[PDB]
Amino acid sequence: GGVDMPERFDAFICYCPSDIQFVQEMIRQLEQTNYRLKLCVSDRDVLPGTCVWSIASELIEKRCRRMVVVVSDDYLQSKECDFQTKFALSLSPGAHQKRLIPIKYKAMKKEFPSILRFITVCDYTNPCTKSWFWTRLAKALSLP
Numbered sequence: 001g002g003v004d005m006p007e008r009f010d011a012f013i014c015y016c017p018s019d020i021q022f023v024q025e026m027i028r029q030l031e032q033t034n035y036r037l038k039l040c041v042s043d044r045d046v047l048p049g050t051c052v053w054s055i056a057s058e059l060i061e062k063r064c065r066r067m068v069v070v071v072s073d074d075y076l077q078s079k080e081c082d083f084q085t086k087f088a089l090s091l092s093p094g095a096h097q098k099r100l101i102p103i104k105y106k107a108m109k110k111e112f113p114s115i116l117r118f119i120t121v122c123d124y125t126n127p128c129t130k131s132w133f134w135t136r137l138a139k140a141l142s143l144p
């Protein structure tokens, strides 16, 4: 009986503490789609009421198919961004679009991270794509 703890994950969610409220909203919404996503973060304890799992940093590239990147002005200054930027720069040609899913959720005064310049963004601020935003993100994350 019961629920298993995953060995491999659909995605790691990379975010700085300033953006935790967005991540809390995202996880609940993704859990309310017709998918059973396997999601991980550095510390599940700060995301109560969710099905997310904790993962050691050194295991992320090996065990996560993709990385969701929550981008904001605050994020650009964070150690979490340092980790994600190094991760992105470690990737071979073609791997960036296959493994990175950047999300914007509020206005930014700063330019988007250099390494994400050719990467498709999930823009939560655009009302024109809002109705199916979470469903489409969940489908994207569920794919190999």
Ligand SMILES: [Mg+2]
Pocket: 124, 125, 126, 127, 128, 130
């Ligand atoms: Mg909207």
